Design a protein around this ligand. Sequence first.
Ligand SMILES: [Mn+2]
Ligand SMILES: [Mn+2]
Lengths: 319, 319
Amino acid sequence: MIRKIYDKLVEIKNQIYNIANYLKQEIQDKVNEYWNEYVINHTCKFVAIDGGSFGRPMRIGIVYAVGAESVIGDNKGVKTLSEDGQIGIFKPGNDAQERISLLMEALELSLALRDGSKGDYILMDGSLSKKIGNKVDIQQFSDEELKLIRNVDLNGIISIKDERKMRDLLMLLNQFLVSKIIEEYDGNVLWISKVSRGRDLFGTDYPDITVLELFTEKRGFSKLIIKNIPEIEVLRKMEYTTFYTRLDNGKRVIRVDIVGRVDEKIVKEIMDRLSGVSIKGYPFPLLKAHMDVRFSAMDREKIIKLVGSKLHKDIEWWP
Amino acid sequence: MIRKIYDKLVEIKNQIYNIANYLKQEIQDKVNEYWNEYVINHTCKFVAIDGGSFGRPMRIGIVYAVGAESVIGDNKGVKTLSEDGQIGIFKPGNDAQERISLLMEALELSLALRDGSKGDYILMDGSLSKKIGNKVDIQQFSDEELKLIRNVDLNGIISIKDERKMRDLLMLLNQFLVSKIIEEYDGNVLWISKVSRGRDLFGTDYPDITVLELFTEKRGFSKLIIKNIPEIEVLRKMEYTTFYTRLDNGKRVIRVDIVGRVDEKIVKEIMDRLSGVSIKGYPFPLLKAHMDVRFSAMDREKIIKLVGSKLHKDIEWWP
Ligand SMILES: [Mn+2]
Ligand SMILES: [Mn+2]
């Protein structure tokens, strides 16, 4: 780093005060209007799914690894149910990082169908909007390619020649997989995120979730927001509900999306139940799922070493 | 990481063999056709410029830091010339990482104008194509905004309200800055990259630069490729030359773009001169520039700590 930069900082006061003042005069009032304290709490099984992935640009191509885990938790305990993950190589390309992540999302969502029915609720890591992905051109696709979607053939989608088509087929797969989850599990799926760009509530330069963390402290929940978006088409008139909750005094606020109509009572029931498997304001089942699938710097080191050995072993003219 | 995933890898032979053969049967022949050995080498001043940056999503916004450095090097030595860098905060946004990087590119290119004339050649880190950026909508811009471009007012461009306009104004600034560099320094600018997606040469699934690293060992250079792309308009009929060179037996291949026509003799002169400030196949002036501007994990830690103190000190209601 440049020594000059850091000395100089020890300039930015202009932006700090601006943002502070703007925020104070924009919505110190409306926050408390739109927040509901819920301080009292009150046996219920959660299956949590999260995923991890990475890809490193190399000469043989983009060497990647994806993994997802389902985790069952209650009062009595947490244990892993399933693990699902592949290591592999993609050919060089502009959407390689995005294909890797979509492939990861694929495994998560498919574990939601595998083990979802083993609990009362399913906790996914990430928002409904983000898991669904953007709109996809359904016209570059032949009859055969649409089937891969229907039959949930990952090995097949991966085997595609073209790059744009692979990213796009994987996007479709995820939309079809969300759709199955929604129809099988109705309001029992909770899509939870620590981060969000939503402004439905306050309509400011900053996101709502940040607004609530600045101007409320106590355990609670926000005004409910009602949002909209083959079988995929049955997801076009899905209306869902968003709220923001803090499960524990002084801790982070999270976003929850639940497909269906939901009321105060349901929200308080969902908070009370989540609080029983939560640590420091967040559901342990998820934190665990997340921690297990993460690829440490060390994990990455191991993987590359392995792959580079199988190169140097199989191929003789390789440097 | 999921134990299962790594056990399993200790599957992928399918892809490793497939790639290997394809590559062997695609161009083990054409490589040597298109590679020129140049094993013999033969006082010349290089100014290198590189840049570093980062931004961390936080509640106050995206806290970022950019920095660029010019470095003068020859036979006798290397020393830093200028350092140029800012710390700041952006409002939350979808193009915040891109604005940060474009802001970084701005400082690099402006140091190329500052200190470029102090050397015989100027080494930039990165390709011509990438530094120029994509095409920009010149119609959302008023007269006032186009002037900020013309006067090189970073403080002004940063102060804009709207996000799409800021990214787009910064893109323009870079195009205008490259354009000044090209006209003041003609073929004296060498745009060097370790990575590239070019396929002009071999037209394969893998990039050319990877093809040459696999199938040649010795110091040399490739067939020359001739490519195309207010003052920016004077950059639309810029034709430039690309070649790939390895400066040192057994080492990496780099891409060089130089604006102008260039021949074998020039290429061999440029290799010979670069070899004299190069270590293990790469020009030390750049490596140094790059190392100095890099933001270590530790650098990032310090910066955040500082910023978070200036919040908690200035703002009282801040958590
Ligand atoms: Mn995740
Ligand atoms: Mn750089």
